[PDB]
Design an enzyme around this catalytic site. Structure first.
Site, PDB file in Angstrom:
ATOM      1  N   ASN A   1     -12.304   7.885   4.654  1.00 44.20           N
ATOM      2  CA  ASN A   1     -12.366   7.178   5.815  1.00 44.20           C
ATOM      3  C   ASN A   1     -11.384   7.349   6.971  1.00 44.20           C
ATOM      4  O   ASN A   1     -11.864   7.040   8.135  1.00 44.20           O
ATOM      5  CB  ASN A   1     -12.004   5.298   5.651  1.00 44.20           C
ATOM      6  CG  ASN A   1     -12.960   4.652   4.616  1.00 44.20           C
ATOM      7  OD1 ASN A   1     -14.052   5.121   4.868  1.00 44.20           O
ATOM      8  ND2 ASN A   1     -12.733   4.124   3.855  1.00 44.20           N
TER       9      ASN A   1
ATOM     10  N   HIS B   1      -3.715   6.551  -1.781  1.00 47.13           N
ATOM     11  CA  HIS B   1      -4.392   6.703  -0.580  1.00 47.13           C
ATOM     12  C   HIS B   1      -3.216   6.662   0.549  1.00 47.13           C
ATOM     13  O   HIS B   1      -3.734   7.159   1.627  1.00 47.13           O
ATOM     14  CB  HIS B   1      -5.167   5.421  -0.088  1.00 47.13           C
ATOM     15  CG  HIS B   1      -6.342   5.680   0.733  1.00 47.13           C
ATOM     16  ND1 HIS B   1      -7.341   6.853   0.786  1.00 47.13           N
ATOM     17  CD2 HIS B   1      -7.185   4.717   1.398  1.00 47.13           C
ATOM     18  CE1 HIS B   1      -8.331   7.053   1.417  1.00 47.13           C
ATOM     19  NE2 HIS B   1      -8.276   5.590   1.710  1.00 47.13           N
TER      20      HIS B   1
ATOM     21  N   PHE C   1      -5.553   0.197  10.135  1.00 45.32           N
ATOM     22  CA  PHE C   1      -6.177   0.279   8.874  1.00 45.32           C
ATOM     23  C   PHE C   1      -6.423   1.929   8.468  1.00 45.32           C
ATOM     24  O   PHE C   1      -6.702   2.457   9.613  1.00 45.32           O
ATOM     25  CB  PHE C   1      -7.785  -0.314   8.997  1.00 45.32           C
ATOM     26  CG  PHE C   1      -7.691  -1.788   8.942  1.00 45.32           C
ATOM     27  CD1 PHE C   1      -7.059  -2.526   7.776  1.00 45.32           C
ATOM     28  CD2 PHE C   1      -7.998  -2.675   9.908  1.00 45.32           C
ATOM     29  CE1 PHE C   1      -7.233  -3.918   7.619  1.00 45.32           C
ATOM     30  CE2 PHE C   1      -7.885  -4.079  10.038  1.00 45.32           C
ATOM     31  CZ  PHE C   1      -7.520  -4.647   8.960  1.00 45.32           C
TER      32      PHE C   1
ATOM     33  N   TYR D   1       0.671  -1.223  -0.151  1.00 48.55           N
ATOM     34  CA  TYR D   1      -0.168  -0.002  -0.096  1.00 48.55           C
ATOM     35  C   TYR D   1       0.994   1.261  -0.038  1.00 48.55           C
ATOM     36  O   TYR D   1       0.321   2.499  -0.300  1.00 48.55           O
ATOM     37  CB  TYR D   1      -1.134  -0.260   1.173  1.00 48.55           C
ATOM     38  CG  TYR D   1      -2.318  -0.921   0.752  1.00 48.55           C
ATOM     39  CD1 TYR D   1      -2.345  -2.464   0.914  1.00 48.55           C
ATOM     40  CD2 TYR D   1      -3.165  -0.386   0.014  1.00 48.55           C
ATOM     41  CE1 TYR D   1      -3.282  -2.999   0.574  1.00 48.55           C
ATOM     42  CE2 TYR D   1      -4.418  -1.344  -0.406  1.00 48.55           C
ATOM     43  CZ  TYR D   1      -4.210  -2.542  -0.110  1.00 48.55           C
ATOM     44  OH  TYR D   1      -5.399  -3.647  -0.587  1.00 48.55           O
TER      45      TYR D   1
END
Length: 197
Positions: free
Chosen positions: A118, A24, A70, A19
């Site tokens: 988020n 993001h 997360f 990631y």
């Protein structure tokens, strides 16, 4: 000059090598680069659910944080660290990917909504339902369609687009240096004229 509001800079992220270069994680890129230039290696502190550091910039003490949660649980890390060190929401700047700005652009902002992000949504919640933290909005552009947004932000930008991103990261870091020396108005004045080409 010497008065500016920021004690903690957070770069939002998902964890791990798969990631790391997704869109993001743009906020983390800013923190990583600032740390690199200032010779600090981040420390994994499980108490804070993240990677942490402390920088001295123009005699201003600046803590940094890249959560290992997360993305949707970013607030756990931010709250844990801010509550330990007695940092107010209004003294936090959260660097994050911004769908509503193009690659190569970045802006500072105080307050606002989460925009469906988020990490921002959890940050608001975990900081006592307080929106009034500062943001460093790193433009990543937007796909056509609403249903494609999650796939887009979890994707890696192609090379040319990544150049524009890296250029905005670089200027954002320069302007965070200026924030610490000249204050927010002058930092914002410079950042908001920047557009990578």
């Amino acid at each position: 000059m010497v008065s500016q509001p920021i004690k903690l800079l957070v770069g939002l992220a998902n964890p791990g090598p798969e990631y790391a270069k997704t869109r993001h994680n743009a906020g983390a890129w800013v923190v990583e680069e600032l740390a690199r230039i200032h010779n600090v290696t981040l420390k994994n502190e499980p108490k804070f659910f993240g990677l942490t550091g402390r920088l001295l910039i123009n005699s201003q003490e600046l803590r940094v944080l890249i959560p290992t949660t997360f993305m949707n649980l970013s607030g756990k890390a931010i709250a844990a660290l801010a509550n330990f060190y007695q940092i107010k929401p209004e003294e936090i700047m959260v660097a994050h990917d911004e769908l509503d700005l193009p690659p190569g652009v970045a802006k500072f902002k105080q307050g606002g909504g989460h925009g469906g992000h988020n990490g921002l949504k959890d940050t608001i919640s975990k900081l006592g339902n307080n929106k009034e933290f500062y943001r460093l909005r790193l433009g990543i552009g937007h796909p056509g369609h609403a249903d494609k947004v999650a796939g887009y932000v979890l994707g890696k930008a192609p090379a040319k687009e990544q150049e524009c991103l890296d250029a905005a990261v670089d200027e954002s870091v320069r302007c965070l240096e200026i924030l610490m020396k000249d204050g927010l108005t002058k930092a914002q004045n410079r950042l908001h004229t920047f557009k990578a080409e």
